[PDB]
Design a protein around this ligand. Structure first.
Ligand SMILES: [Cl-]
Ligand SMILES: [Cl-]
Ligand SMILES: [Cl-]
Ligand SMILES: [Cl-]
Lengths: 313, 312
């Protein structure tokens, strides 16, 4: 089963780093298709094609992603602008909403059965945009639409391991909710081998929720979280590919589930041959987490409604 | 606890290289990032969120000394890249000065480090680095390298595709230098490959002009950055392994016996002091012997240009 992974937004900061990681991490025989408007894109593919791995790479540019999307099983969307010094979530939605819409319109007609991973922010909102564009095209499969939240997981694993003296490579931290601010809810109470003092929970939780700011407000001037976001995306794509290939994997991801909390909600999901295999429950929460969960819902629902309205008016 | 420093960590190669090193270096290795651009501390914070046991820190401003404290390996990728129509030598005027400045700081801050020059033109900038190191009275031939590893990746890739070999396990030696006519893949030493008369020259020319092929395909967006980062990361991993006591052999541009040129790329066993032993190029085919004769005058001029930038 020769998998095909397409990257829409392969010329941007996240996109190029993601192209590199996929070239190095994808299983042998996988096809990697890179697309973006900029004419540098075919050149990004040629650059990447020189790395000696058994992953076939092709690059495409111009206004039409259809050629790049041919036979795609996984479509990763990293197009648009990332959060940079002096930009609010409003700037992201302002620029990225129309970009995501146009790309999904092409996914809908070119590879409607692909699993789509939305990396472009704000994920809470941009995933709803994608769902509505797919619905309008009459091909919406909620098992195949994902908001990539994995970066919150990487950050959680890194900080928990640092603070509690655990193995950074083998520490597991579930993260539920959404992908921004108070919607990011790391389930610190479910981490093994970590004894928490009351005073550590809130500061660590706020640190994880506000981690993007540490990058933007770094000394001397700061920048965007380009590289960690690419690795988070690559890690997610890896899990999707495994699921599509028949291997059992579980990832916290933003999907349209039972709607008990919000239409879209990130929780553990077992991935399979059709994308979502089973949306697993969030498990037991501490009083702090239960409270944090209840607190985020109005913000999350608003993020969702903003994306739905962008397409439906 | 080994320490790897990247001078030019905010550029295209640099950022990608910071990412790969964070993911590929052994557990407990320190990674230090520096660039004049003020985004560099942010690049390190960005990379630090990736959960691996590699500790990373970033530095900016005009002084790289803080970034070089205790470095065992120093990778220099700073400077500008090619524009469509240029050869690697046309970058000399801008990059010669950037390399000199950085090496003056390496010379006084971490003179015992293995220095890998990625900044083009490598054939010349390595010579610049050597002479700067000599004026500081700390030049150690065993610790200065021109990174040619991208020629090896390209060779491995093109040979595996053309000859039906395993791309992960095909070994292709590459000698000479790092420029159009100085890159010499020793296709005759590749195992499991019967070469047709008409296959050798086109494949050699393809390996030699690969940098130009990426440059043209990017349509003004620069030269190779992503494959170059992996090539630089692989070379760094080999140096670290050598420094740690493991045996590894890599084709790399170093100051040897001067038989071909003062600096020449050939297989080198790496060890605790950097170069452990510069190995012979082995048997060459008639085509390879002739390709080697044809490059020597160009290679010698590339070196002399770098020597004259510092000495006069
Ligand atoms: Cl490699
Ligand atoms: Cl979001
Ligand atoms: Cl890697
Ligand atoms: Cl990871």
């Amino acid at each position: 089963n020769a998998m095909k992974v397409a990257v829409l937004g392969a010329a941007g900061g996240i996109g190029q780093a993601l192209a590199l990681l996929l070239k190095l991490q994808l299983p042998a025989g996988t096809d990697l298709s890179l697309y973006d408007i900029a004419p540098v894109t075919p050149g990004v593919a040629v650059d990447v094609s020189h790395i000696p791995t058994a992953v076939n790479v092709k690059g495409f540019s111009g206004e039409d992603p259809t050629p790049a999307l041919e036979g795609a099983d996984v479509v990763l969307i990293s197009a648009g602008v990332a959060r940079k010094p002096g930009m609010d979530r409003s700037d992201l939605f302002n620029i990225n909403a129309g970009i995501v819409r146009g790309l999904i319109e092409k996914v809908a007609v070119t590879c409607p059965k692909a699993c789509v991973g939305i990396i472009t922010n704000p994920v809470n909102t941009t995933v709803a945009i994608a769902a509505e564009v797919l619905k309008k095209a009459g091909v919406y499969d909620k098992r195949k639409l994902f908001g990539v939240t994995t970066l919150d997981v990487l950050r959680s694993e890194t900080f928990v391991a640092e603070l509690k003296g655990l193995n950074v490579s083998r520490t597991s931290v579930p993260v539920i909710g959404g992908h921004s601010g108070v919607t990011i809810l790391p389930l610190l109470s479910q981490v093994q081998y970590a004894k928490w003092n009351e005073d550590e929970i809130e500061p660590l939780t706020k640190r994880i929720q506000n981690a993007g700011t540490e990058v933007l407000n770094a000394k001397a001037g700061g920048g965007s979280a380009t590289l960690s976001m690419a690795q988070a995306a690559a890690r997610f794509a890896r899990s999707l590919v495994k699921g599509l290939s028949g291997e059992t994997v579980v990832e916290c991801t933003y999907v349209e589930g039972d709607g008990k909390y919000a239409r879209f909600f990130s929780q553990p999901v077992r991935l399979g041959k059709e994308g979502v295999e089973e949306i697993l429950p969030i498990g037991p929460l501490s009083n702090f987490e239960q409270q944090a969960l209840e607190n985020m819902l109005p913000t999350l629902r608003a993020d969702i409604e903003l994306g739905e309205k962008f397409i439906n008016g």
